[PDB]
Amino acid sequence: AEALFKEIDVNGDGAVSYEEVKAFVSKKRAIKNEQLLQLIFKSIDADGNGEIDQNEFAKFYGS
Amino acid sequence: AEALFKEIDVNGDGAVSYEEVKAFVSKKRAIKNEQLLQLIFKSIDADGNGEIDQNEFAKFYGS
Amino acid sequence: AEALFKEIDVNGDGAVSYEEVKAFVSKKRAIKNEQLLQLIFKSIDADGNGEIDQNEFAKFYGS
Ligand SMILES: [Sr+2]
Ligand SMILES: [Sr+2]
Ligand SMILES: [Sr+2]
Ligand SMILES: [Sr+2]
Ligand SMILES: [Sr+2]
Numbered sequence A, B, C: 001a002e003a004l005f006k007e008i009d010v011n012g013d014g015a016v017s018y019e020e021v022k023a024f025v026s027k028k029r030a031i032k033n034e035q036l037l038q039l040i041f042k043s044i045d046a047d048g049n050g051e052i053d054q055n056e057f058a059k060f061y062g063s
């Protein structure tokens, strides 16, 4: 992966160190979760106004 | 959930922000784990005196 | 476990506290992951020279 190697290799020395792999992995886990949480958020917030009022939170219960 | 919305909404402005959801989730994950760990602890500690001596720890091995 | 109780019991008072269990668990989770990551690393790095060049990273893709 052209682009991908360049992302993980932060100092740009053409090599991917351990700290680098360990960092990318960490970074990736983070984003993945952020992304999932927001998807759930923007979801509950029906009127996408950025907040969840008692009603939306209320309409968010199937059992 | 009456009580529940009030817990997640910390500043009490009637709304639940993203930071708020993200926080509650975090808080919840924490407690869940604490609770599980302790259940395992209080378990091994047969004489519930708050400590696990070599014997209890010893009697805690099925294979 | 002879050796094991002594590892978890850090202050060496013959007892294993909660903080102690909670710590060992944490410590263990850490090592386990470090170990796995490295196994993946040393793996990709075919010439075990400590770095992963564009080629190895390149030869590391089955689909
Ligand atoms: Sr590098
Ligand atoms: Sr809304
Ligand atoms: Sr709020
Ligand atoms: Sr005990
Ligand atoms: Sr102790």
Ligand SMILES: [Sr+2]
Binding pocket: C045, C046, C047, C048, C049, C050, C051, C052, C053, C056
């Ligand atoms: Sr190499």
